[model samples]
Target: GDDRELAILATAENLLEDRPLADISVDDLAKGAGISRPTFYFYFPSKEAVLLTLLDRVVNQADMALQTLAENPADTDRENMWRTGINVFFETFGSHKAVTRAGQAARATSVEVAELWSTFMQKWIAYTAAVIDAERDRGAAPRTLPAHELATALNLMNERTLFASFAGEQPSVPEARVLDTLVHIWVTSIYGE
Candidate 1:
């Protein structure tokens, strides 16, 4: 990565540390990188493009969290899988709260950002459904809810919790118990008591 690209992305992250994306401007992102006005477009199409680059990191890491279970061997420790997977979920989103919050805010108005979020969610939901089907077939997890319904609801829980936590909305789960609570919910919901 060239210094110019690095500067642009770094400035975006820094500016967003305590501010909403709407509060930010292209010049804030560009000159914050020690760049001239027009040089911003040379590296990024717009401020939105810079955010998309940062969001790429967040969503991709979260995707790998779900993949943890999908890639596990049948005999692997179930709780361990769930815990480790959700660990990455919390850590990635928690650490990158600025990027996640900005990207989520952009979702309402940016088709490109919205589509990225929707596609990743569909992948998580599908993978979760597959796991539920396999567990039920193994007679390890009893049928509580339909697989798709459970998967959708579980992923939605994760998505909403993450967003709310990042946004610091009221009733947000504290950082201390967020992982423990989410892991327990997912495990019990999908596998059993």
Candidate 2:
């Protein structure tokens, strides 16, 4: 039973990679998963529910990466630690880029999905703010803005830049350059280097 449900979700995620979420249909998903429309509804209330589940899975992984960074930050080489955290974020998000792209699109139209996205981001913001507070305590970061505010701004920058880069919207700039720019911003913003 669980396997069938997972298969349905996998099919949805795979379909998302090729086209926008709105382009997909319940019948198509059911057929793709080798199930009937009734079977699809048995596993999920609607196609959006399947997408929310997939988005949750990806967000959970990214949240773990962020939590790991927060709980066990490096004592030395703060800049390198920042770079590592950024890399983990990009890497984890990259792994689920298709679902993420779909989620981003659905977010604008689906209130539930948008709320989930916002709540997911809030946890990261809190973790980042805590890190910023620690940096200030260590005299490594400046007092330009409150920790929460700075973290919010920094995280929003990452979200926008990463989404744009991953979506291939910035064809003029290579992905390597985008990563470099992100890391430089984080390092310089927090470490004042």
- Judging by TM-score against the true structure, name the best candidate: 2
User: Candidate 1 on 150-174: residue-level lDDT in tens?
Assistant: 9999889988886787677898987
Kindly provide the TM-score of model 1 when superposed on the true structure, using C-alpha atoms: 0.89
Q: Give residue 174's error in model 2 in angstroms.
A: 2.8
Off by over 4 Å in 2: 74-76, 171-173
Candidate 2 per-residue lDDT, tens place, 1-193, comes to 9988988998998999898777899998999989999989998999999899998888898888777776786776767787788887788877888987888888888888899989988988888888888888888788777879889999999888888778888443455676678878887887673
The lDDT for every candidate, in the order shown, is: 0.83, 0.84
List the candidates' TM-scores in order.
Answer: 0.89, 0.93
Overall local distance difference test of candidate 1: 0.83
Model 1 spans > 4 angstroms off: 65-76
Best candidate according to lDDT: 2
Tell me the deviation in Å of residue 75 in model 2. 6.4
